[PDB]
């Protein structure tokens, strides 16, 4: 279950390994749409948060 | 005995959280022979703590 739109959850990542292979590996992730930063280069841009 | 275990009836505005490994929690105690010398220098050098 998700939140509502101006109920919207916010999520706090910190000190751990991100992995989005899943979300480039994965055949049912059918819809993924990024301008802002490049798709297949996030893998090596390390965030704060 | 550990009472009053709430001080917020909702959560309004939570920031920051962090689990680590649990400290030399000794149960009890002795009067008398100090054994615990605890030394901690505390120092905050941009940004990490």
Known sequence: RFASVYA????????????????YNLAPFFTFKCYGVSPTKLNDLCFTN | MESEFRVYSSANNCTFEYVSQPFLMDLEGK????KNLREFVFKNIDGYF
């Not at chain 2, 009067?31 to 100090?34: R, S, T, V």
């Open chain 1, 8 to 23: 919207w959850n916010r999520k706090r990542i910190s000190n751990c390994v991100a992995d989005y292979s899943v979300l």
């Open chain 2, 31 to 34: 009067q008398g022979n100090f």
